[PDB]
């Protein structure tokens, strides 16, 4: 909301300056996003009177005869250029804001234009360049420099939050400032009414959409340009002056957050009807847009006999036809309170955002209509020589606000302050509250314009911001936390430790969006996503990811394109969605591998990624095993499931070649697990001190048989005294059956309290020979070394 310093000063005369104003508002709860000086008026721009407008034959231009001290002529093509108005004359020599070259005397279509009359855009006071600025013909003595009646202005760009709709009016802002201690000057609505009947009626057919609705009656109207002070005010606030009546309705709206509209009676008929719109009912709005209404739209309608027609979109925009123009003589003034929800939907429905919809959507003072009528009617009498009726048409009876609890003691207790009771109450009163009672808990009833004041807490914030948030001391709390808050952080800590270990083990962390391309469920071969977005950022992000690896792969590609990483070991932890939201850990391996950069031999691919993972789980103290299992997105030959502490939690393998190809990528290795990983409670095992028995033995087995079964078989039968068991050599060759393998196993036995006899070790290898043969396996080695 634009806040013109000099306009606000009219209500708060003691304001120190725009800068101090910015500070006051900030402490009140209103942040200014910008402060700027806006009305540059050169000395060369003087006020002129248009004595006559003569058309230039054969052109669409007029020859204006101006009284600018001395008579002068100017050529103008502005439709509104006419006799009897005051204009802004830029004399030859004047330099205009934004214009490159100066303004000089120029010959146009046969006539010497001594300077030129200006549009709001040329003078630089507004965006409008479709016509000349229209001033009252007597606004100033002819030829007086315009600046003398139009000083530069400073305008604050204020942010006004939802909770402060009363602040959508300069007078509302002034009241907040008044509470701070500033003197407040409310406009006096001098009105000379007349006891006459209103030549029209009011019919509110929908009191749900228009809880309070009033109509004022002003006649004998002399429509003309608004005085210079008002045009400066409106322009500063970002609004374009139109004329007497219209400007007054915009001014009062901006002054007291009360949108209001003047309806030319010529079009009202017998009365005004506030009703819902009838299917397809047309309406040409003020903006010139021809619209079609919806049955949910509240409208302001008129009626004549059996005829019923829309006059304007209630609380959003008036109709073009009954706008208030030069020949208008009488009007029905609409000042009301509409249902916010209703206005909200209508505005959206027609893609309209107006100063009026904005205010009604945020809320208007439920009992401010009548006071607003006096203000407007008063100004109309003063500026349009209006004659006004003493009575109003009123429908609806809003209830005043109820009293609220107020404990000084609680205010200080909640804030941690110690404001004296008297200061607290004086503050609530300056804001317009009523304070009743004596005891510790008072009865405070807020003024109707305060829709945000309902709870006692609300009242403490009133005290806090007026005293000033800076006056709240600093403290730190102390207390023994409730028992069930104990170790509630274990989960979070568990995961962060995991990330840290991974970063130390060698993996590089990556962050990928939670969004997924619906199409990737296909490209990457996996069940479609269970959750989709009704309003996605793009179709490539219309769903929620089901896996973490797809994103990692797309990251590798994007990297290989921008830069040429020769390799990469990444990892990412994130939320995945599929039947249930769960946390995943995924890793990716790519490149030549690990080894001497100046040599050739290397360790890479699958078994390398499996190395890091085994290290990771060794570091975490968790059992890690990988058994072959099929996965659509993985290579059928290099694919297995991951098991931690004997429990399937994910997968490990190489990206499927076909998928790799479509993505145009070299071989890729990866894994994905479900977090949190299993917790393995310590169970300290006192290491035996006696010597350990060593003994090797190879095992002949079919090429298909997985190392897992062998290891498992050997171990199982190895006996209660098996300490170690490692695979030091895999041989598949000539010395034995074709299509077979031999597994070199390093074994170790040991006893807790004593030493192992040479027989016990044999009795142990025996079981490893009997149970080993029972499975169709043989053993070449049988002794160490």
């Amino acid at each position: 909301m634009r806040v013109p310093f000099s306009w606000l000063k009219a209500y708060v005369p003691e304001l120190e300056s725009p800068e101090v104003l910015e500070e006051r508002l900030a402490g009140l709860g209103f942040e200014t996003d910008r402060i700027e000086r806006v009305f540059p008026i050169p000395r060369g721009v003087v006020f002129a009177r248009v004595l006559e407008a003569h058309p230039i034959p054969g052109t669409r231009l007029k020859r204006l005869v101006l009284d600018a001290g001395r008579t002068v002529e100017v050529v103008s093509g502005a439709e509104n250029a006419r006799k009897g108005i005051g204009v802004a004359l830029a004399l030859p020599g004047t330099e205009l804001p934004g214009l490159g070259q100066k303004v000089g005397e120029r010959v146009i279509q046969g006539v010497r234009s001594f300077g030129m009359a200006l549009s709001p855009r040329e003078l630089g006071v507004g965006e409008y360049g479709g016509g000349l600025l229209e001033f009252p013909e007597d606004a100033l003595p002819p030829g007086t420099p315009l600046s003398e009646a139009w000083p530069e202005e400073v305008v604050l760009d204020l942010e006004v939050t939802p909770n402060r709709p009363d602040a959508l009016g300069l007078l509302g802002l002034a009241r907040d400032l008044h509470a701070l201690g500033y003197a407040l000057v409310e406009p006096e609505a001098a009105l000379k009414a007349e006891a006459l009947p209103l030549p029209f009626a009011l019919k509110v057919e929908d009191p749900e959409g228009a809880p309070h609705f009033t109509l004022g009656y002003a006649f004998g109207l002399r429509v003309a340009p608004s005085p210079l002070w008002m045009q400066r005010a409106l322009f500063a606030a970002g609004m374009r002056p139109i004329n007497n009546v219209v400007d007054v309705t915009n001014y009062v709206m901006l002054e007291r957050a009360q949108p209001m509209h003047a309806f030319d009676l010529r079009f009202v008929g017998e009365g005004i009807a506030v009703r819902r719109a009838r299917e397809g009912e047309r309406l040409k709005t003020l903006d010139g847009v021809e619209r079609t209404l919806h049955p949910e739209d509240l409208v302001i309608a008129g009626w004549r006999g059996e005829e019923s027609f829309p006059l304007g979109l209630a609380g959003v925009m008036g109709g073009a036809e009954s706008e208030v123009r030069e020949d208008t003589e009488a009007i029905a003034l609409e000042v009301a309170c509409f249902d916010p929800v209703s206005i909200r939907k209508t505005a959206r429905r027609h893609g309209l955002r107006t100063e009026a919809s904005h205010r009604f959507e945020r809320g208007v003072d439920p009992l401010g209509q009548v006071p607003a009528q006096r203000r407007a009617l008063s100004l109309l009498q003063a500026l349009a020589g209006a004659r006004v009726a003493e009575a109003l048409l009123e429908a609806g009876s809003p209830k005043p606000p109820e009293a609220i609890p107020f404990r000084p003691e609680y205010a200080n207790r909640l804030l941690g302050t110690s404001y004296p009771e008297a200061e607290q109450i004086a503050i609530l009163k300056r804001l317009g509250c009523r304070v009743e009672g004596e005891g510790p808990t008072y009865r405070v009833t807020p003024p109707s314009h305060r829709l945000d004041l309902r709870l006692e807490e609300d009242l403490v914030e009133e005290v806090a911001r007026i005293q000033g948030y800076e006056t709240i001391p600093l403290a730190l709390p102390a207390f023994f936390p409730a028992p069930d808050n104990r170790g509630v952080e274990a989960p979070y800590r568990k995961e962060q430790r995991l990330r840290e270990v991974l970063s130390g083990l060698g993996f590089q962390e990556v962050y990928t969006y939670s969004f997924m391309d619906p199409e990737d469920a296909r490209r990457f071969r996996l069940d479609p996503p269970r959750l989709l977005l009704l309003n996605p950022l793009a179709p490539e992000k219309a769903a929620l990811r089901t896996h973490l690896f797809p994103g990692l792969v797309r990251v590798l590609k994007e990297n290989l394109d921008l830069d040429r990483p020769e390799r990469a070991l990444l990892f990412e932890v994130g939320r995945v969605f599929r039947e249930r939201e769960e946390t995943h850990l995924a890793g990716l391996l790519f490149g030549e591998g690990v080894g001497l950069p100046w040599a050739k031999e290397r360790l890479s691919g699958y078994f390398l990624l499996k190395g890091y993972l085994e290290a990771l789980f060794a570091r975490l103290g968790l059992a890690f095993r990988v058994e072959a299992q099929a996965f659509p997105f993985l290579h059928p030959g290099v694919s297995g499931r991951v098991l931690v502490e004997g429990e399937e939690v994910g997968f490990l393998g190489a990206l499927h070649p076909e998928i790799a190809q479509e993505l145009e990528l070299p071989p890729v290795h990866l894994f994905e697990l479900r977090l949190p990983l299993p917790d393995k409670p310590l169970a300290f095992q006192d290491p035996s001190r006696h010597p350990a028995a060593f003994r090797d033995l190879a095992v002949v087995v079919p090429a298909p048989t997985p190392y897992g079964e062998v290891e498992a078989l050997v171990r199982e039968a190895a006996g209660p005294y098996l300490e170690s068991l490692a695979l030091f050599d895999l041989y598949q060759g000539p010395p034995l059956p074709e299509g077979h393998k031999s597994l070199a196993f390093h074994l170790r036995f040991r006893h807790p309290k004593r030493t192992l006899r040479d027989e016990e070790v044999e009795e142990a290898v025996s079981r490893v020979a009997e149970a080993l043969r029972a499975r169709g396996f043989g053993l070449r080695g049988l002794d160490t070394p």
Binding site: Y612, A615, L616, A618, A628, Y707
Partner: protein, 266 residues
């Protein structure tokens, strides 16, 4: 195809020593309470280890610590403010001297916790060490009371053993504390009271030695109108009970089969 069940590259998997873990948890517990961890030097002067802590020479009180005296020239012992200090060198018998070093180098109020290797000349059995670790605590400032010391230990016990845990405070003597005390925590799982350490309200004379050392250094006095409490607990024993280690000598034993069993504790 490939045997995906074959062991992968034998990359190394590291681990942290059990004392590092126990120290880390203790430090995390007190960090949550506003304490900051600072360390002191293992080689101290008699002044910081004893004299400044109201433990004069040739008195029964000093027998509570069997010192390891040192000899050797060329060694420079830096004081709280980098200034070179002198005095009979020794191996700190406790972390307590850091109470003094910290206070000369800082101003109240504050909360610190100093973990550290300490040394004592005595025979090592299955439950005794000549070399071990302690965790000191020091909180100073206006209005600091013993109620606050009890509050700290209660929180320690809760964090370490759960809601069915409790603390016990009994009078005991230390030259550096006027109420003096010894505290134990109830270990539910083992149904028994373990003595964790000693504590008390910083002795008047400690604050005086601190400010006197400050004056002799140009700094203004900073501890005339403050009180505070301090405590010191011995890490190994807590770690033993917590990790089920039967022999305290295992800690410095260096045996990998022992150390490796703690990789799981991240």
């Amino acid at each position: 195809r490939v045997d995906v069940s074959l062991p992968g590259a034998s990359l190394f998997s590291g681990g942290l020593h059990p004392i590092t873990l126990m120290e880390r948890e203790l430090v995390e517990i007190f960090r949550a309470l506003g304490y900051q961890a600072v360390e002191g030097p293992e080689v101290e002067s008699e002044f910081f280890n004893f004299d400044a802590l109201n433990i004069p020479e040739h008195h029964p009180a000093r027998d509570m610590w069997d010192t390891f005296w040192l000899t050797g020239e060329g060694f420079r012992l830096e004081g709280p403010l980098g200034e070179e200090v002198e005095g009979r060198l020794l191996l700190r018998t406790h972390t307590s001297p850091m109470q003094v070093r910290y206070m000369v180098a800082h101003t109240p109020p504050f909360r610190i916790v100093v973990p550290g290797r300490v040394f004592r000349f005595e025979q090592t059995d299955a439950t005794h060490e000549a070399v071990f670790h302690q965790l000191e605590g020091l909180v100073v400032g206006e209005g600091i009371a013993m109620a606050h010391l009890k509050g700290a230990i209660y929180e320690l016990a809760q964090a370490l053993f759960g809601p069915d845990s409790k603390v016990r405070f009994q009078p005991v003597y230390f030259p550096f504390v006027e109420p003096g005390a010894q505290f134990a925590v109830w270990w539910p799982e083992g149904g028994k009271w373990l003595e964790l350490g000693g504590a008390g309200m910083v002795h008047p004379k400690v604050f005086q030695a601190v400010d006197a050392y400050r004056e002799r250094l140009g700094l203004p006095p900073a501890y005339r109108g403050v009180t505070g409490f301090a405590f010191g607990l011995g890490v190994e024993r807590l770690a033993m009970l917590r990790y089920g280690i039967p022999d305290i000598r295992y800690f410095f034993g260096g045996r990998l089969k022992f150390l490796e069993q703690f990789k799981g504790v991240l």
